[PDB]
Amino acid sequence: HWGYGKHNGPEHWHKDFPIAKGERQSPVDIDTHTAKYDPSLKPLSVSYDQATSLRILNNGHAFNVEFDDSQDKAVLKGGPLDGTYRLIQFHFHWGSLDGQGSEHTVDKKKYAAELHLVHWNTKYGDFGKAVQQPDGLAVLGIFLKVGSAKPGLQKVVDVLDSIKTKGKSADFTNFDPRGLLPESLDYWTYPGSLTTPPLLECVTWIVLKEPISVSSEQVLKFRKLNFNGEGEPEELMVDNWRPAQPLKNRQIKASFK
């Protein structure tokens, strides 16, 4: 199986998922100087007031906080998007050290982690159908730097010891993802892909300029998670990020400045 270990990491994925070397792969380096301001972009609309979290799962690659997406409750719209995208889950990618961990980079700068709020286009009826379409998903990307704690993150951090190993899940209700957003919704956007296999080219990426601050103790707790299942040799869950991929024939647009 693919992973991020010594022998099955990102440079190996193409052998099972040939679209790894495709025309619209993610993440990418965001060259701030060459991203053009696009005054036709709209403000992003993040409507998470009715979000219903249900569960948190260690899937052996990251942990996902899953939402009830059976009704139009936590939606992302506007920005570069046409139509309405419903929140299904969020997860993070992070490093073994504070100097690395994000998937997207900003003029080659790597952040300590990166949060992905994953949304699917309601015109496709469900997630599984949406990932088959070029405009199927919108992922809202938010950088994490180490500094002041993020109080809105602590409930997530505190449950991780209950889902240490691959395939563990825990009840995770009433979590409000608004506590994870920075103050500004200024963003960059570009057409890309899932950053893990199956690496489908179905994502409008929206990457916020303003990172959120999390404490060293918070990100330390992410690094105590395990890639392995229970009663297998311990492999800390760290460096679960794909490096920047060739931008190819794509423009990154800025909503600002």
Ligand SMILES: NS(=O)(=O)c1ccc(CNc2nc[nH]c(=O)c2[N+](=O)[O-])cc1
């Ligand atoms: N193209 S892909 O899906 O990324 C993929 C890549 C590599 C494999 C073989 N994996 C391994 N082979 C040898 N030793 C190991 O320790 C692992 N391992 O770590 O799994 C299987 C699938």
Ligand SMILES: NS(=O)(=O)c1ccc(CNc2nc[nH]c(=O)c2[N+](=O)[O-])cc1
């Ligand atoms: N890192 S990211 O780009 O935000 C991101 C990556 C993967 C997903 C959903 N995963 C899947 N999607 C479709 N088919 C699949 O088979 C899987 N799967 O097997 O996981 C959602 C978001």
Ligand SMILES: [Zn+2]
């Ligand atoms: Zn992700």
